[PDB]
Amino acid sequence: MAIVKATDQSFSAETSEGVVLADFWAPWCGPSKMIAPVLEELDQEMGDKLKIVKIDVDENQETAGKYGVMSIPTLLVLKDGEVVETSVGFKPKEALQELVNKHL
Template sequence: MAIVNATDQTFAAETNEGVVLVDFWAPWCGPCKMIAPVLEELDSEIAGKAKIVKVDVDENQETAGKFGVMSIPTLIVLKDGEAVDKVVGFQPKEALAELLAKHA
């Protein structure tokens, strides 16, 4: 399953069922660029168990505001559309895998 880029308009439809890891990011953010390949690797390992959705905070301020995103990258785990966990800053792949496993 490929990583999905969601907008304010498509966010609810992309995240309303199952376990979803949402990456709030921006193109100018250094740590966001560092975590992108980690998320790509993780996506191939969790295929079928969880979904990864990216939200550009500059272009989708409504969604970022709804989740209280103050710094990026912020990664929020949603389960059936409800936020169940949150981490801020760069995380290694193993930490993100554990985070998702707790809610799978």
């Protein structure tokens, strides 16, 4: 639908329903600026079925640290309020769309 943004508790408020792709990015790494356009390229293709959400892991890293994410990029695939796939490394557009399409 859009690249939504989350924080300390708004993660859960955005992921408890539907199928949702949470992503974790910050200035620390190069992939932070490659996964980002890949996610916008994902939303404009299949955001009709999928929500995407981001945590900035310097401004809003509390959710990441709480879950035990500490690493860039990181991706938590959720549906109906639980994780169903996990990724802790960069993926191109086609591979990232496949990663969520497995459970969407």
